[PDB]
């Protein structure tokens, strides 16, 4: 069962086994479809990491927010052969063809992190990034 933690109502963390991520939302396109790995099914994620725990935690998170792997848009991760390190990126922009998915993602996030305010506003480019982090000392362990 993964642990979820919100610090200062703005910084989001998740931990499961030997993996922990910080989750953030802003307009920086770290990954692009022409350079990085496209993820449509959980098994595509073997190219995202050499760590099975990182892969499992990523899949758990996406399932928990209500990502439908079959129907919903694909997301991106950095190829494990690159030196920059593990990261996945989801387009949660509340705009155009993405609006339905973005609204669902927002609902999922509100269920997982009650006290996080929605930074993905109407029309704005908003890309969720999940990256490795040390588990903060101010977060709990159970």
């Amino acid at each position, epitope marked *: 069962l993964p642990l979820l933690c919100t610090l200062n109502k703005s910084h989001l963390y998740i931990k499961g086994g030997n993996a922990s991520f910080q989750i953030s939302f802003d*307009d*920086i*396109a*770290v990954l*692009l479809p022409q350079y990085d790995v496209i993820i449509q099914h959980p098994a595509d994620m073997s190219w995202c990491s050499k760590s099975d725990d990182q892969i499992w935690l990523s899949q758990w998170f996406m399932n928990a927010v209500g990502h439908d792997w079959h129907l919903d848009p694909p997301f991106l991760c*950095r190829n494990r052969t690159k030196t*920059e*390190g593990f*990261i996945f990126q989801v387009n949660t922009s509340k705009t155009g063809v993405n609006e339905n998915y973005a609204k669902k993602f927002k609902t999922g996030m509100h269920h997982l992190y009650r006290e996080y305010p929605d930074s993905c*506003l*109407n*029309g*704005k*480019l908003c890309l969720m*990034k999940a*990256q490795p982090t040390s588990w903060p000392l101010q977060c709990p362990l159970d």
Partner: antibody
Amino acid sequence: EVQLQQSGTVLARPGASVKMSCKASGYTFTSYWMHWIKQRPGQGLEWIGAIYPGDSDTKYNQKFKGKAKLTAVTSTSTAYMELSSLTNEDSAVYYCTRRNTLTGDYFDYWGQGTTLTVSS
Amino acid sequence: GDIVLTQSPASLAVSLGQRATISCRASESVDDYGISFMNWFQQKPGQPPKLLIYTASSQGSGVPARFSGSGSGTDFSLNIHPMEEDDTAMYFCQQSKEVPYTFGGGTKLEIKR
């Protein structure tokens, strides 16, 4: 081809207000934050703030709250900055610049600069 | 709270054909997402700053290969080699990790004679 065309040199008296403009072309004006930068004669660069013309969202450097007001007219792809309660410290070159977020956060295109001279 | 960038040297003179190296140190890390949010600009008199390098090491549009950015965390460098006449300018580093965006104090590059 991306171009940012700023308004001409402006002279203002101490205590007055001034509004300067930055006309954008060659890209979708409502898809990018437009930032404003101050450069005093022979000095470095200081960040003022930014506007997102797509929804009128604004951000300010704490140092310029109450000094600068940023607006936009999307029908003409023009960003505006109003400076109030002018003093000698406001005499400077002011730049507008487009922020890009593709694999970074960077000011990729810049206006040519507007000189403000505050004098009696 | 604001990130402070310290450039060195304040000025330098380099012979044509030789190497110019400019350093920028940040008061805290500008890394996130596996990349470094540090950019470099060139400014000539009467002209706006021109983006040379973004995200520490990516080449700006049309920027010659003689300009090279490196570094991560808090320590970054711009190298120019070989120095050409048209490279005389002010050079500024800038962090884009946190608002307010902040710039280094500038380094003036001159031709040695």
